[PDB]
Design a protein around this ligand. Structure first.
Ligand SMILES: O=C(O)CCC(=O)C(=O)O
Ligand SMILES: [Mn+2]
Length: 204
DNA sequence: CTGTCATCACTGCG
DNA sequence: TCGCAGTGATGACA
């Protein structure tokens, strides 16, 4: 197993293909059968005073007794199911990092996406990495430095682009999430679904 | 309670 | 097809 070190100013991440094709295919099939995604209010978001559907399906799973916040609201993730525990255990066995929570984002095709953002670290264990595991269609992932955004950025730090492949793990390490925003842009030629699992270590 | 700060994804272009 | 510029109500925080 080979790791690519992704390095830039205030960016430290590591990328590998963690699951081979056969295993990744099995896992994808099981995620597609079993994951229960949000419906109703949790699948809506208000942006500049207009209501939209979240442009991807989402779900959370995690340890018993954990709660988290979604926009001021206190929520409980769903209990682990075996396929998710299988993924988590492989990530932990390889990296030595442990997680108690996962956010699942399912992009039905290239029109589902997520805009430039930094992960909310407020309820995360201090200094903890985030482990991003991907199954299904490859999708382009983009890191952009915080001071290189918008119309007249103060700095011209180069963007960092990579595809996240089927069965891959991207470890995003501190201080990546302080200095960089990441996104999964629209890619209209991608017709197939992708399921991404972002494992986190939440306080408690 | 107040006031600052960061934030989410769309439309309408080019 | 890609992606820029412009669009604010809301919650975190001190
Ligand atoms: O789908 C992805 O790889 C990114 C998801 C992500 O960054 C997030 O939900 O915080
Ligand atoms: Mn993220």
């Amino acid at each position: 197993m080979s790791w690519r070190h992704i390095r830039a100013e205030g960016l430290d991440s590591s990328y590998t293909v963690l699951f081979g094709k056969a295993e990744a295919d099995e896992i994808f099939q099981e995620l597609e059968k079993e994951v229960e995604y949000f419906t109703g209010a949790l699948a809506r978001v208000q942006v500049f005073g207009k209501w939209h559907s979240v442009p991807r399906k989402q779900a959370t799973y995690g340890d018993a007794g954990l709660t988290y916040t979604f926009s001021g609201l206190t929520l409980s993730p769903k209990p682990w199911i075996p396929v998710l525990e299988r993924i988590r255990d492989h990530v932990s066995g390889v990296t030595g990092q442990t997680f108690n929570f996962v956010l699942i984002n399912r992009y039905k095709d290239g029109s589902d996406h997520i805009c430039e953002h930094r992960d909310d670290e407020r309820e995360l264990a201090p200094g903890s990495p985030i482990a991003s595991v991907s199954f299904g269609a490859s999708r382009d992932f983009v890191f952009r430095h915080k001071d290189s955004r918008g119309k007249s950025p103060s700095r011209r730090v180069a963007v960092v682009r990579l595809p996240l492949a089927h069965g891959s793990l991207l470890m995003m390490n501190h201080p990546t999430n302080t200095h960089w925003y990441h996104s999964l842009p629209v890619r209209k030629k991608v017709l197939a679904p992708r399921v991404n699992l972002t494992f986190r270590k939440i306080l408690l």
